[PDB]
Amino acid sequence: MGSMERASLIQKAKLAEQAERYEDMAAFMKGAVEKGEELSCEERNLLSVAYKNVVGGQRAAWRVLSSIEQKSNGPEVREYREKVETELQGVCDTVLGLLDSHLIKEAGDAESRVFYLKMKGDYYRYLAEVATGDDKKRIIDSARSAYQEAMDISKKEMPPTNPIRLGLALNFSVFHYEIANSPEEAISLAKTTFDEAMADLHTLSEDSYKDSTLIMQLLRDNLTLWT
């Protein structure tokens, strides 16, 4: 997207979201990142929304095909599952590449750095969902390491109700439950996160209260399923 203005890429990413054209949205936001400037809060969210939609569709398709393949056990189901899997891995590698070149290293404020490290954990987690064997082990450790660094920063630099801090804890708890085979760690993290946020709600405006309690309900929803 080298010939398009940064501001035009951002404007077109917003239009693509409205049109539910998420592959386009991700390509526009990749082009915007590759302009080399840091991203604002709104721009980071556009980048994340675009890729979460793209990879979310791929993950849903991979799960459908993997279920059919498991029930079957010609080569067609495996071949097509592998094709979708390779595409999914390519998108994850693209996002991880943007984070490594050079979003994370230039992110000095806690809000941006935690945001990008949470993304890094998420996309390694999506790689882990389809990985098999010892490659899975190193991918899992990469997700854990990214989430842990984000957690350490968020606990030092953000209030317990901050929505990015809450969403990070939610997703790290899912990592523990679904990827790392650590359901007790998942439950403990979700419970502690919820309780510390509850005790801080009194400091918030009406609008911030709505933002934080929406994510707290997601933590509670997981706790209800897990206990």
Binding site: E17, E42, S48, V49, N53, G167, L170
Partner: peptide, 9 residues
């Protein structure tokens, strides 16, 4: 188990 939906700005 649900992660952040994260699919709408």
């Amino acid at each position: 188990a649900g992660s952040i939906p994260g699919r709408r700005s």
